């Protein structure tokens, strides 16, 4: 239940974050005060889970960036592993996958000994070993489609 | 340089991208103008990059997302593949990559079959192989992390 208005509103939000009212307004053809409320209405279904801006992480001393797929050293206990890691913040992503490892997480540091520190960090507390793979280059990232 | 007032700037911006010149500016302990002016500065130093609202995927319809890691058929021809990539819009990243393949896409469909599709269309646009891995939960996804 998304309908042509929801879809344009989340379309430039997408694209604009921070699109004010009034400019998503004139766009939707709606009044401000229906624009604002069809927007909390979308944020409170979760379609629009937050807003954030998207800070370049070489800028800000993440010149390491990998992907690390992450599999149970004893696959016995249900899966702590999203929660236990949840708290080390050069982890960026979780996702759990299909195949033979069971999460991958995109991981971002410092530098390549950054990274061996992060990788006995992450086999430790998850209990977990460990596939590494490093990104040499992003040519593009999050770019969201609304079809 | 990244005066780390810069620093109490982007970690605000990241956690909330509609946090709005004033309300920050509290918090960080400045004019509503100079706030103003070091983000306009932020922006043209390629630090923010843009503002984005984080949009769920499944409910705009993606049901099936899936890294998908490619690699090129022919080592003789250019290598340009993120550019004959980057006009099918259902990518939503393109790294390149130091593992067993050249690079890693994130891919977002509306179901198993419109996958298998997708991977037809990735073959013969850019002239690779693909191995795909599907993704069943994300747990947590773009915590942007700042020193
Ligand atoms: N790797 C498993 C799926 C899985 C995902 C997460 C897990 O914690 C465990 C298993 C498979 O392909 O069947």
Chains 1, 2 share one sequence.
Do not use: K, M
Not at 7 to 32: K, P, W, Y
Not at 104 to 109: D, E, P, Q, S
Not at 114 to 130: H, S, W
């Amino acid at each position: 239940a998304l309908d042509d208005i929801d879809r344009i509103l989340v379309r430039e939000l997408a694209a604009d974050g921070r699109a004010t009212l009034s400019e998503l307004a004139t766009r939707a053809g709606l009044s401000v005060s229906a624009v604002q409320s069809r927007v909390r209405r979308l944020e409170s279904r979760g379609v629009v889970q937050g807003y954030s801006a998207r800070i370049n992480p070489e800028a800000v001393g993440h010149l390491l960036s990998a992907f690390v797929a992450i599999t149970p050293l004893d696959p016995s206990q249900p899966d702590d592993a999203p929660a236990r890691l949840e708290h080390i913040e050069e982890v960026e992503s979780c996702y759990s996958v299909a195949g033979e490892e069971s999460y991958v997480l995109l991981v971002r540091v410092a530098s390549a000994r950054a990274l061996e520190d992060l990788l006995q960090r992450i086999r430790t507390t998850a209990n977990v070993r460990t596939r590494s793979t490093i990104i040499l280059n992003t040519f593009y990232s999050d770019r969201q489609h609304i079809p």
